[PDB]
Amino acid sequence: DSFYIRTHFELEPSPPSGLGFTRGDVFHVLDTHWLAVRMGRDLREQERGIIPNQSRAEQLASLEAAQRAEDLSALTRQGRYPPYERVVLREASFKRPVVILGPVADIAMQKLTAEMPDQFEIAETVIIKLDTVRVIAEKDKHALLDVTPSAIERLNYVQYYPIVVFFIPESRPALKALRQWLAPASRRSTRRLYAQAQKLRKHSSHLFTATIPLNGTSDTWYQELKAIIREQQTRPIWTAE
């Protein structure tokens, strides 16, 4: 047989063929102890190898449960996901949340809702709740999110699959200029924000669905932004088969 599978328990790599996985990873199982291939955010096949069959998989999961006595295990329970979940690709039947990362999340989010109140609303955070995002997607709008990598992994896990856009700053000066021009009254460290972007790029790259170079003070990055949201909104995402 052949199909796509999503894994809901942890497994360590194993020499030479055995593949390791984490809650949320997806495998194109080529043949059925199963021959499988990992699927990256690219949707392009990556490491080829071996993975446990349904039966061994169920045991390995029961085991990992008993051993209990960004960790996503509470969601696997609250979601009632099985060790293996057969998935297929479909275009989202809802407007996908949009996560803006980088030193202009605030500017980007204000301009979007100001220009298009009917397609965008900022998700209100105090701590972010899924229901907040759900309520906004129900109004048929993109929920705009300013959140951590951890938040992003949770949304990916429950299959809201945000569009994640990271903005790359030229330099601390170049960013201070940009901010002074687009957020004149803003009182926030051009310094804390630049270093934050560096931290995100270093360790969080894997969660980005797009990056966009901040290269001046013109509307270009904002233009590319808008095009990228409308495009990736048509791209097929994983969903339960």
How far CA 228 is from CA of 35, 112, 164, 202, 212, in Å, comes to 35, 13, 10, 22, 10
Range of the domain at 69: 1-92+234-241
Beta-bridge mates of residue 164? 99
Residue 121 sits in the same domain as residue 221: yes
Give the C-alpha separation, 26 to 34, whole Å: 14
Same domain flag for 81 and 198: no
> b/e for 73-90, b at 16 or more Cβ within 10 A?
eebbeeeebebbbebeee
Q: Torsions phi, psi of 135, nearest 5? A: -60, -40
Q: CA 125, CA 129: separation in Å to the nearest integer?
A: 8
Q: Are residues 74 and 10 in the same domain?
A: yes
One domain, residues 145 and 171: yes
Tell me: do 81 and 127 sit in the same domain.
Answer: no
In degrees, rounded to 5, the angle at the alpha carbon of residue 123 between the alpha carbons of residues 128 and 187 is: 90
Q: Return the CATH number at 114.
A: 3.40.50.300
CA atoms within 13 A of residue 34's CA, in its CB half-sphere: 23
Q: Which amino acid is at 205?
A: S
H/E run at residue 135: helix 130-138
**In a shared domain, residues 64 and 103:** no
Q: How far apart (Å, rounded) are the C-alpha atoms in residues 177 and 54? A: 56
Tokens of 101: 């990362």
**102 and 166 Cβ atoms separated by less than 8 Å:** yes
Rounded to whole angstroms, the Cα distance separating 197 from 194 reads 5
Among 99, 109, 106, 112, residue whose Cα is nearest residue 145: 99
- Can you tell me the distance from the alpha carbon of 116 to that of 225, in angstroms, rounded to the nearest whole number? 14
Clarify whether residues 100 and 70 are in a common domain. Answer: no
Q: 60 and 98 in one domain?
A: no
72: CATH = 2.30.30.40
202: left (phi over 0), alpha (psi -120 to 50) or beta: alpha
Q: Are residues 87 and 148 in the same domain?
A: no
Q: How was this structure determined?
A: X-ray
Dihedral (CA of 180, 184, 190, 194) sign: negative
Residues 178 and 201 in one domain: yes
Tell me the structure's resolution in angstroms, rounded to a single decimal.
2.8
* Residues 30 and 107 reside in one and the same domain: no
Best CA proximity match to 168, nearest among 198, 192, 191, 208: 198
Quick one: 102 and 221 in the same domain? yes
d(CA 34, CA 117): 48
Structural domains of the chain, count:
2
CB 162 within 8 A of CB 99: yes
Which helix (H) or strand (E) element contains residue 111? Answer: helix 105-115
The residue assigned the tokens 């759900």 is 134
